[PDB]
Write a protein that binds this ligand. Structure first.
Ligand SMILES: Nc1ncnc2c1ncn2[C@@H]1O[C@H](COP(=O)(O)OP(=O)(O)OP(=O)(O)O)[C@@H](O)[C@H]1O
Ligand SMILES: Nc1ncnc2c1ncn2[C@@H]1O[C@H](COP(=O)(O)OP(=O)(O)OP(=O)(O)O)[C@@H](O)[C@H]1O
Ligand SMILES: Nc1ncnc2c1ncn2[C@@H]1O[C@H](COP(=O)(O)OP(=O)(O)OP(=O)(O)O)[C@@H](O)[C@H]1O
Ligand SMILES: Nc1ncnc2c1ncn2[C@@H]1O[C@H](COP(=O)(O)OP(=O)(O)OP(=O)(O)O)[C@@H](O)[C@H]1O
Ligand SMILES: Nc1ncnc2c1ncn2[C@@H]1O[C@H](COP(=O)(O)OP(=O)(O)OP(=O)(O)O)[C@@H](O)[C@H]1O
Ligand SMILES: Nc1ncnc2c1ncn2[C@@H]1O[C@H](COP(=O)(O)OP(=O)(O)OP(=O)(O)O)[C@@H](O)[C@H]1O
Ligand SMILES: Nc1ncnc2c1ncn2[C@@H]1O[C@H](COP(=O)(O)OP(=O)(O)OP(=O)(O)O)[C@@H](O)[C@H]1O
Ligand SMILES: Nc1ncnc2c1ncn2[C@@H]1O[C@H](COP(=O)(O)OP(=O)(O)OP(=O)(O)O)[C@@H](O)[C@H]1O
Ligand SMILES: [Mg+2]
Ligand SMILES: [Mg+2]
Ligand SMILES: [Mg+2]
Ligand SMILES: [Mg+2]
Ligand SMILES: [Mg+2]
Ligand SMILES: [Mg+2]
Ligand SMILES: [Mg+2]
Ligand SMILES: [Mg+2]
Ligand SMILES: [Mg+2]
Ligand SMILES: [Mg+2]
Ligand SMILES: [Mg+2]
Ligand SMILES: [Mg+2]
Lengths: 244, 243, 265, 266
């Protein structure tokens, strides 16, 4: 009975520092293999991104403390307002519930968008999740800038890579050697001149990723954007509730 | 890069080496979940079969899991003390387990309840926590703790719902009858007042579920519904749980 | 080496970057300690001067310390938010501060109380804890918290010991006399029964002690681009600026904080 | 008061995992410079080590949870029994108390051993202190082995270095360049063949360090949840009033030394 419950004293809770912005980032586990197994289109599978986006928006609509979400590829980052008391700011609760939620929402929406690709039990969509604290909103701006810069680099690379492979019939291995050394202008030239692709004409979602933001009128409703957030300061300034 | 410094704000937790790790998952809002999908009360057999299939599948994927114990909407997994899965990072281990149990549950649900398709607002989610134990006797006491808790809670729920269904008590009147009572009292209340013999309840409901890796010439996963609190020989004949 | 793996069991705690750090040290068993060396009651001036000398000395050695507040057997130190002392290691920051205050206290004690050599079973020990605050408004409220506490404990102790020393009550009956009492009552007890006006007590006893780094020609001149020899000059001025001591209200006087912008930066 | 006390909620305590061995290691801050300022004898200053040993033994006689201590140079490691509840196993409390205790005990004993070299305010003996958890006693064995091997390595280097400088009248740079590359056996010969010094003739304390142990005579091992209340208190009494013995011996390779002291494991 009560002779075993002392083992409860070995648990250690981690209460995240109060009045600090929390970022929760989730990223698909082994999604390179996952995207091969389910034959994702390359470089970008549109419906696969729409599954991520439905999952993230659904989560965000469940927790009014999530003010802003940014996603691309197999990742999503969620901004929690600094006065968030969700699960008393317990790190274990916030992170394992977020990876659990994204996982199950992903499975739900996958069966909707891909009815002909039923999930195999050895290839279920799993996510990790980590919480990071940022004490000042300038780090929050820089964080999302970090994630959008990364979206740019990876999409430009992948779009070039997969066009070398699919249009020029290169194998993945010869595509990589072709790109070693190349800078951004080079990849652009290769896409236009060799593959007949104008990179600037790629979908805004592929190039910029996806922003889900909570909108307030008399400072709520969820709106989705595919825009620059790195250099457009007015985008943030007209949204002061992201900071409060 | 001018933005990547933000990575330096991340803080990892590497769990103390050479210590046993328990990962415990527990269903999020499973009161509501069990009502929405019209689970049988006090215990739903097929729901438990879904948990057990999920846990067995996870365990068959991760050779570091030596033992699992489940009852109700929870499961505990023992990782061997020299486990190096994700370099023993707490963030990785716990979010992987909550993600794994969640999706395995969704997968197995559709096998066991083809007639109860999952609703977008009622998916099976789990939390997950890691606990360190520096000595195997604490691992023994840990699984004893969970099994005793299975007993206490199964007794409570079985008694409560039979007071309501057999004696036609209201929820408050049943709660009022149970105030103060200890386990032997609840067992007696069931027999004498509700006409239910608790000892005849299913062993799974009473004892919970143990999944253990069996080695012969010290592998196979075997499922048990047996006492592990007082049977020292059950543990003693399985030294690989310690090692 | 076959034994050095044991180093891997150590766990460092690097305090979150860009946040204010408060270190609070507090004397271990200073009730018993102040009895053993027969401190004057309610306040021993020279014992407080020993604490203030220790804190001023520590602060003169570590330019990241921007502000210190003390009373009784405690001192709190504000580290600027971009402090990199020991790479923000919690273990290093706290045990250094408890060690420093302990040794500075023993040194200054032998200067101020040459006739009371310290006994080996009653050495002055301090704990020390680091606390993070993500916004400067929390730093203001933190120091308000400590100054409100200084007021409360000093009003109680002054009433208590005047009941004992002037009215010849035993400690326990003085304690019972004060059970239930609120602030105006303690004030009345002191005035009407003991002939002491609490408002006439020393500012140091009532308000505590503030040690602040003072800068003269300060502009928030710091940004990531400016570097090299400019930064060394900013660092040099922080070392060779003057520590001023105050016994003033810092709870409600915003202009005191407002005219000292380098505390936030 | 009530509107400001919320700031208390930002504090984060670290409760060290129950029932695991705790090692607290303290090491003197900047004792290289400290040893030069007060003109420590080189390679080893006997009275300086005696100040450390007195400090450690006094601490150890004050805290019955400390079962074993090992010191050499400017460091000491203290072993806490597994069931130690000193300050509820709070890491902030355990560590800042130890760095504080060692610092003040050192200052105290220094004035006993060095009455003519009073401590200067810019050269006080300060210590850091860290707590480390070890879940199995074999790691405790290896920890103290680790520290004694380190003691051997540093004493041998320092003995060779200072004999080259002080006897052979070498400059610091060449003594240092002379030792680059050398292993223990090389150092042993430079001392013997070139300095006429037999390293084994050095004091055992310098070579082996200092072990301080709590000794029990009529010890039987039983430690359990069942025994409680005042029963725990006599075991506390036995532990508080037990003898501290000092040794300067190998503990790396001597299994019988440990096996005959089973109370260290509890
Ligand atoms: N402080 C405690 N002391 C002893 N037992 C506890 C304590 N808190 C919870 N328990 C028990 O431990 C078991 C594990 O459940 P769990 O830890 O999820 O409790 P909970 O209240 O849901 O807490 P959490 O918020 O951590 O999920 C429960 O049966 C519960 O009764
Ligand atoms: N919508 C998509 N369309 C096409 N490919 C995708 C899509 N989403 C993900 N991928 C593939 O999944 C990969 C995710 O890369 P990531 O850096 O997360 O590695 P990972 O395989 O998920 O490994 P990890 O377990 O370390 O996260 C991408 O490189 C791409 O190969
Ligand atoms: N040490 C680092 N410094 C800067 N950026 C990094 C570092 N490690 C990873 N990144 C980048 O951070 C982004 C987030 O990836 P993530 O945090 O999942 O890292 P990872 O390398 O997969 O490690 P893990 O998932 O094991 O923590 C990725 O774009 C990755 O390229
Ligand atoms: N197999 C099952 N049959 C019947 N009921 C079940 C079953 N599994 C779970 N439940 C119901 O779900 C509840 C889960 O209890 P728990 O204390 O975990 O509450 P919860 O709603 O899941 O809250 P939390 O989110 O804090 O875990 C049980 O008390 C029971 O009512
Ligand atoms: N990364 C490491 N790996 C193995 N041994 C180390 C390492 N760092 C230090 N040591 C050794 O550990 C012993 C204890 O020294 P200590 O723990 O004080 O570390 P340190 O290097 O002084 O750094 P700090 O005191 O800042 O943690 C010393 O003998 C040192 O040589
Ligand atoms: N300058 C002084 N004059 C007279 N007495 C003092 C002075 N400074 C400290 N004291 C005594 O020391 C006490 C310090 O109180 P505190 O609340 O820190 O308790 P403590 O005995 O130090 O216990 P702890 O170990 O929890 O800090 C005061 O109550 C006061 O009696
Ligand atoms: N839980 C609490 N909430 C608010 N104030 C507290 C709390 N505990 C202590 N305090 C107050 O905080 C001030 C600082 O004292 P300190 O931080 O040393 O705490 P303590 O109660 O002595 O416990 P410890 O020093 O062991 O952490 C004192 O005024 C004390 O009365
Ligand atoms: N008893 C002693 N006799 C002679 N020299 C000593 C003695 N104790 C300490 N020292 C000197 O103090 C030094 C302590 O070495 P340690 O590695 O701790 O460096 P430190 O200068 O104290 O730096 P840190 O602050 O990182 O500890 C030794 O190298 C030696 O020079
Ligand atoms: Mg990753
Ligand atoms: Mg991934
Ligand atoms: Mg990714
Ligand atoms: Mg729970
Ligand atoms: Mg649950
Ligand atoms: Mg539960
Ligand atoms: Mg205290
Ligand atoms: Mg005190
Ligand atoms: Mg105090
Ligand atoms: Mg060191
Ligand atoms: Mg040192
Ligand atoms: Mg040293």
């Amino acid at each position: 009975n009560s002779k075993y419950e002392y083992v409860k004293l070995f648990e250690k809770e981690n209460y995240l520092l109060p009045d600090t912005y929390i970022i929760i980032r989730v990223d698909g586990k082994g999604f390179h293999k996952f995207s091969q197994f389910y034959e994702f289109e390359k470089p970008n599978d549109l419906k696969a991104l729409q599954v991520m986006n439905s999952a993230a928006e659904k989560l965000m609509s469940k927790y009014s403390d999530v003010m802003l979400a940014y996603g691309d590829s197999d990742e999503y980052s969620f901004l929690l307002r600094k006065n968030c008391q969700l699960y008393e700011r317990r790190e274990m609760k916030l992170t394992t519930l977020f990876s659990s939620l994204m996982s199950t929402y992903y499975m739900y929406f996958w069966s909707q968008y891909f009815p002909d690709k039923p999930l195999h039990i050895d290839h279920l969509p799993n996510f990790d999740a980590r919480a990071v604290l940022y004490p000042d909103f300038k780090h929050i701006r820089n964080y999302f800038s970090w994630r959008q810069v990364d979206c740019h680099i990876n999409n430009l690379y992948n779009t070039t890579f997969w066009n070398l492979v699919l249009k020029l019939k290169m194998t993945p291995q010869q595509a990589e050697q072709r790109l070693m050394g190349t800078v951004a202008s080079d990849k652009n030239e290769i896409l236009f001149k060799e593959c007949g692709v104008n990179y600037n004409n790629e979908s805004e979602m592929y190039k910029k990723g996806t922003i889900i933001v909570r909108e307030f009128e008399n400072y709520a409703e969820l709106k989705i954007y595919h825009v620059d957030i790195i250099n457009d300061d007015s985008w943030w300034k007209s949204r002061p509730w992201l900071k409060d």
